RNA sequence: GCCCGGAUAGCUCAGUCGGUAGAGCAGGGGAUUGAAAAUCCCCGUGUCCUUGGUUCGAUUCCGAGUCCGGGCACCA
RNA sequence: AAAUUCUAAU
RNA sequence: AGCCAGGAUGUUGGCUUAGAAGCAGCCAUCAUUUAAAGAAAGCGUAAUAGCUCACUGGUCGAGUCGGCCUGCGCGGAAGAU
RNA sequence: GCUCAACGGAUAAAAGGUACUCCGGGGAUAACAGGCUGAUACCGCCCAAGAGUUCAUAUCGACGGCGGUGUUUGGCACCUCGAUGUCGGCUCAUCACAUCCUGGGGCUGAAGUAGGUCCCAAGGGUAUGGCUGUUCGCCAUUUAAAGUGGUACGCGAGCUGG
């Protein structure tokens, strides 16, 4: 997990999901692409 | 770094930065960055943004710089008291009002100018927009 | 009951005569070393043709103390001086090949069975 | 590879004045070989030899493939002949010593990059009354890659001390590299040159 | 940081009072010597530190700059 | 009345 | 958007280098069969291979897809009795 | 008849030291501490040429930009000059978390053992000596670790006096 003030899509598998009032990125291909806004 | 080759006077007052802008149209290129916010552009910022937009078009087309930093900004040395004179010139700025066109670009596709005008705005302290030519 | 700055005798033929304790290994803020405890020593005098030279920095094990040891029935054993056997920094093995004077039962562990074997007697 | 400009150095060995004469003749030979190649020769320095040629002549040759052709001339050269500084007709043997060097870039990067500096500020010592006690007017800078440490507390201002201590650090880190380069080139010259004594030689 | 002085031939140095620059050593050719030096004769010197300006004209006069040398940087 | 020097193979 | 099927042909290219073949970097970016298919957008080889996408057919079957101007909110947001 | 140029001109006529000092006043005005600010200091974040064999983001981040804190050096001169005792050491502490150890996790260019980096977490713990008045620092030997700061840069009606 990488925590940064600007989460963005990096590949074509990345998805934007808002869980519990937090915006975060997850993709099913590259585990290095998961990130949350903080 | 742009700077006047010679000037009549060495130092200059501070002044104010009120009013809108003249030169709100694109006159040479087909696209440009229009300025929305109000502030100053240092010659270091103009060169930093010009290099980022130049590298993005792969040295294709023409680029116009449409502002010039011709205002000297003084600054006192460190750990001195007030007064005893006026500070020494350190850098040159160009006052920006809401509406000016800062850059121009021609000879490239319309979708490529947006990409180069996105990396250019990231180096500037003033919020900007993207505009095209108008017939009238 | 051995601290830093304590002078000790030497109970082998490694070539040293008086060594001075400079650290009590084993824990933070540790205060004393009893019979069977490894300490850090420096050589204060030596035999002209010994295995060790004056000013060396080594380790040692305490085998005799004036304060003595206490036994499970309440009895005590006391000596007339503090003595130690010189080891090396890495392998924790004795340098000499002989032991002078008696030792105690608290050395009956696999690390110091080389000293128990060579000692004239065990108390 | 090594096809760059060269430094040609030739000096007198055994013989004295006749060694100087032969050094002059040998340098003339090399100058003629260079001029009939479209190469430029310039006299960087000269030390003349009283009667004839040079005690020590060092010149810089500029052109293409200079070092690829002239790098085999190092060592000692022996000459046997009737000298000009001789009353009788005695044949004499003398020697000259020749070295050939390349040229190298000589960048001196001022590694004052503060990303690798450790800076300490602390109180100073001396006569300062009540102000000196409660102030951090002494500076110390350590350069991590080289381990060079410099401190300054001469003035009452932290800024002045930091500035001049940093300047001293730069100067005394540049000297420590210039000395290394000097000793390296001196050693290389020493083992290329030999010791002109008419016993170690490459051609007669 | 502040104040003061200096920058002239290859090297050490004199000089202007706005139109024009020298000395000793060194350098080149030739004499004397069997030869080298000492000695003798003849011959050349330089964008007067960088920059902007006033002047018909600037080494010189007036502002800025660089380098070098000296003095000062105190009461707590 | 002045005036220094001549390496190293016969 | 799902769910089935296809997703082709001479570049083992000179151009660089030992090897570069769509997918390392220098140029060009044509043509054929076709309903479609790029002389290659992605993953993947020392070099091949191998793995997706575009695009095109069938079921489904009613809506669906992104910019512009605006109101109020979200994150960015750590200090000492 | 005055460069009385200190140019509304004090006499025609004039320089310094005081740590041996003294009087009248001032917080109208400085040195310590508090206050406002945050140039400087320290800590985060945005963009991504690039280095990393290939690959911008495993680990770094050129040219530029945006903020936070109130540990440093400063700017101001608002409180105190009918007095707010100023460095270091000793005894005794208490709080913040921007976490040194122990505790829980995500990514790794994570085989294992060992690491790098980023989240959560303040319950407890967090060296002895040589040199120097030293804070700081270097060195020797240990430890799971030898944290960073606030408290009149804590603490002299609690000690010392280098
Ligand atoms: Mg949860
Ligand atoms: Mg010793
Ligand atoms: Mg004093
Ligand atoms: Mg002559
Ligand atoms: Mg002589
Ligand atoms: Mg002779
Ligand atoms: Mg907000
Ligand atoms: Mg007056
Ligand atoms: Mg007056
Ligand atoms: Mg006295
Ligand atoms: Mg009074
Ligand atoms: Mg006043
Ligand atoms: Mg006053
Ligand atoms: Mg104050
Ligand atoms: Mg107060
Ligand atoms: Mg790369
Ligand atoms: Mg404060
Ligand atoms: Mg302050
Ligand atoms: Mg006041
Ligand atoms: Mg006021
Ligand atoms: Mg009072
Ligand atoms: Mg007071
Ligand atoms: Mg009172
Ligand atoms: Mg009182
Ligand atoms: Mg935290
Ligand atoms: Mg705790
Ligand atoms: Mg509990
Ligand atoms: Mg001491
Ligand atoms: Mg504390
Ligand atoms: Mg403080
Ligand atoms: Mg205090
Ligand atoms: Mg404290
Ligand atoms: Mg008190
Ligand atoms: Mg008392
Ligand atoms: Mg005293
Ligand atoms: Mg006393
Ligand atoms: Zn992804």
PDB file of C-alpha atoms in Angstrom, chain D residues 106-204:
ATOM      1  CA  UNK D 106      40.231  17.592 -15.568  1.00  0.00           C
ATOM      2  CA  UNK D 107      36.778  18.315 -14.168  1.00  0.00           C
ATOM      3  CA  UNK D 108      36.729  19.557 -10.560  1.00  0.00           C
ATOM      4  CA  UNK D 109      33.172  19.134  -9.304  1.00  0.00           C
ATOM      5  CA  UNK D 110      32.498  21.194  -6.152  1.00  0.00           C
ATOM      6  CA  UNK D 111      30.613  18.491  -4.257  1.00  0.00           C
ATOM      7  CA  UNK D 112      29.078  20.970  -1.829  1.00  0.00           C
ATOM      8  CA  UNK D 113      25.738  19.173  -2.413  1.00  0.00           C
ATOM      9  CA  UNK D 114      24.099  19.531   1.026  1.00  0.00           C
ATOM     10  CA  UNK D 115      22.296  16.179   0.714  1.00  0.00           C
ATOM     11  CA  UNK D 116      25.457  14.514   2.094  1.00  0.00           C
ATOM     12  CA  UNK D 117      26.426  16.998   4.827  1.00  0.00           C
ATOM     13  CA  UNK D 118      25.924  16.742   8.589  1.00  0.00           C
ATOM     14  CA  UNK D 119      25.591  20.115  10.318  1.00  0.00           C
ATOM     15  CA  UNK D 120      25.771  20.835  14.053  1.00  0.00           C
ATOM     16  CA  UNK D 121      25.074  24.149  15.793  1.00  0.00           C
ATOM     17  CA  UNK D 122      26.171  24.729  19.375  1.00  0.00           C
ATOM     18  CA  UNK D 123      27.410  27.278  21.892  1.00  0.00           C
ATOM     19  CA  UNK D 124      30.850  28.879  21.685  1.00  0.00           C
ATOM     20  CA  UNK D 125      33.529  29.295  24.342  1.00  0.00           C
ATOM     21  CA  UNK D 126      35.207  32.482  25.516  1.00  0.00           C
ATOM     22  CA  UNK D 127      34.401  35.943  26.851  1.00  0.00           C
ATOM     23  CA  UNK D 128      30.860  36.853  25.833  1.00  0.00           C
ATOM     24  CA  UNK D 129      28.953  37.632  29.013  1.00  0.00           C
ATOM     25  CA  UNK D 130      25.268  36.719  29.013  1.00  0.00           C
ATOM     26  CA  UNK D 131      24.618  36.630  25.255  1.00  0.00           C
ATOM     27  CA  UNK D 132      27.174  33.943  24.379  1.00  0.00           C
ATOM     28  CA  UNK D 133      25.740  31.450  26.876  1.00  0.00           C
ATOM     29  CA  UNK D 134      22.210  31.321  25.432  1.00  0.00           C
ATOM     30  CA  UNK D 135      22.965  31.196  21.704  1.00  0.00           C
ATOM     31  CA  UNK D 136      24.081  28.672  19.077  1.00  0.00           C
ATOM     32  CA  UNK D 137      26.794  30.735  17.389  1.00  0.00           C
ATOM     33  CA  UNK D 138      29.181  27.867  16.536  1.00  0.00           C
ATOM     34  CA  UNK D 139      28.927  25.675  13.432  1.00  0.00           C
ATOM     35  CA  UNK D 140      30.364  22.304  12.414  1.00  0.00           C
ATOM     36  CA  UNK D 141      30.035  20.598   9.015  1.00  0.00           C
ATOM     37  CA  UNK D 142      31.047  17.025   8.157  1.00  0.00           C
ATOM     38  CA  UNK D 143      31.130  15.792   4.548  1.00  0.00           C
ATOM     39  CA  UNK D 144      29.891  12.207   4.682  1.00  0.00           C
ATOM     40  CA  UNK D 145      31.458  10.668   1.516  1.00  0.00           C
ATOM     41  CA  UNK D 146      34.976  11.808   2.459  1.00  0.00           C
ATOM     42  CA  UNK D 147      34.828  12.193   6.240  1.00  0.00           C
ATOM     43  CA  UNK D 148      36.260  15.725   6.171  1.00  0.00           C
ATOM     44  CA  UNK D 149      35.194  17.768   9.216  1.00  0.00           C
ATOM     45  CA  UNK D 150      35.434  21.551   9.611  1.00  0.00           C
ATOM     46  CA  UNK D 151      34.123  23.793  12.395  1.00  0.00           C
ATOM     47  CA  UNK D 152      33.914  27.565  12.831  1.00  0.00           C
ATOM     48  CA  UNK D 153      33.096  29.778  15.821  1.00  0.00           C
ATOM     49  CA  UNK D 154      35.183  32.893  15.140  1.00  0.00           C
ATOM     50  CA  UNK D 155      32.374  35.455  14.763  1.00  0.00           C
ATOM     51  CA  UNK D 156      29.199  36.195  16.731  1.00  0.00           C
ATOM     52  CA  UNK D 157      26.864  35.336  13.823  1.00  0.00           C
ATOM     53  CA  UNK D 158      25.869  31.774  12.958  1.00  0.00           C
ATOM     54  CA  UNK D 159      25.346  32.706   9.302  1.00  0.00           C
ATOM     55  CA  UNK D 160      28.879  34.076   8.846  1.00  0.00           C
ATOM     56  CA  UNK D 161      30.422  31.045  10.549  1.00  0.00           C
ATOM     57  CA  UNK D 162      28.401  28.656   8.385  1.00  0.00           C
ATOM     58  CA  UNK D 163      29.350  30.506   5.196  1.00  0.00           C
ATOM     59  CA  UNK D 164      33.087  30.642   5.821  1.00  0.00           C
ATOM     60  CA  UNK D 165      33.260  27.117   7.263  1.00  0.00           C
ATOM     61  CA  UNK D 166      31.539  25.835   4.128  1.00  0.00           C
ATOM     62  CA  UNK D 167      34.026  27.751   1.966  1.00  0.00           C
ATOM     63  CA  UNK D 168      36.960  26.244   3.878  1.00  0.00           C
ATOM     64  CA  UNK D 169      35.409  22.786   3.488  1.00  0.00           C
ATOM     65  CA  UNK D 170      35.203  23.261  -0.272  1.00  0.00           C
ATOM     66  CA  UNK D 171      38.784  24.495  -0.594  1.00  0.00           C
ATOM     67  CA  UNK D 172      40.256  21.754   1.593  1.00  0.00           C
ATOM     68  CA  UNK D 173      38.263  19.030  -0.157  1.00  0.00           C
ATOM     69  CA  UNK D 174      39.494  20.266  -3.539  1.00  0.00           C
ATOM     70  CA  UNK D 175      43.121  20.229  -2.374  1.00  0.00           C
ATOM     71  CA  UNK D 176      42.804  16.598  -1.239  1.00  0.00           C
ATOM     72  CA  UNK D 177      41.909  15.605  -4.822  1.00  0.00           C
ATOM     73  CA  UNK D 178      44.475  17.787  -6.582  1.00  0.00           C
ATOM     74  CA  UNK D 179      47.228  16.197  -4.475  1.00  0.00           C
ATOM     75  CA  UNK D 180      46.042  12.695  -5.409  1.00  0.00           C
ATOM     76  CA  UNK D 181      46.020  13.533  -9.115  1.00  0.00           C
ATOM     77  CA  UNK D 182      49.500  15.058  -8.848  1.00  0.00           C
ATOM     78  CA  UNK D 183      50.992  12.013  -7.141  1.00  0.00           C
ATOM     79  CA  UNK D 184      49.324   9.664  -9.639  1.00  0.00           C
ATOM     80  CA  UNK D 185      50.770  11.494 -12.643  1.00  0.00           C
ATOM     81  CA  UNK D 186      54.179  11.779 -10.961  1.00  0.00           C
ATOM     82  CA  UNK D 187      54.274   8.031 -10.289  1.00  0.00           C
ATOM     83  CA  UNK D 188      53.262   7.240 -13.873  1.00  0.00           C
ATOM     84  CA  UNK D 189      55.988   9.521 -15.222  1.00  0.00           C
ATOM     85  CA  UNK D 190      58.502   7.886 -12.894  1.00  0.00           C
ATOM     86  CA  UNK D 191      57.924   4.329 -14.048  1.00  0.00           C
ATOM     87  CA  UNK D 192      57.649   5.337 -17.713  1.00  0.00           C
ATOM     88  CA  UNK D 193      60.838   7.409 -17.660  1.00  0.00           C
ATOM     89  CA  UNK D 194      63.353   4.994 -16.164  1.00  0.00           C
ATOM     90  CA  UNK D 195      66.758   6.339 -15.101  1.00  0.00           C
ATOM     91  CA  UNK D 196      68.898   7.258 -18.086  1.00  0.00           C
ATOM     92  CA  UNK D 197      72.144   5.421 -17.419  1.00  0.00           C
ATOM     93  CA  UNK D 198      73.125   3.902 -20.803  1.00  0.00           C
ATOM     94  CA  UNK D 199      72.291   0.433 -19.441  1.00  0.00           C
ATOM     95  CA  UNK D 200      68.485   0.552 -19.633  1.00  0.00           C
ATOM     96  CA  UNK D 201      67.618   1.553 -23.187  1.00  0.00           C
ATOM     97  CA  UNK D 202      65.318   0.771 -26.096  1.00  0.00           C
ATOM     98  CA  UNK D 203      67.391   1.846 -29.107  1.00  0.00           C
ATOM     99  CA  UNK D 204      71.010   2.665 -29.929  1.00  0.00           C
TER     100      UNK D 204
END
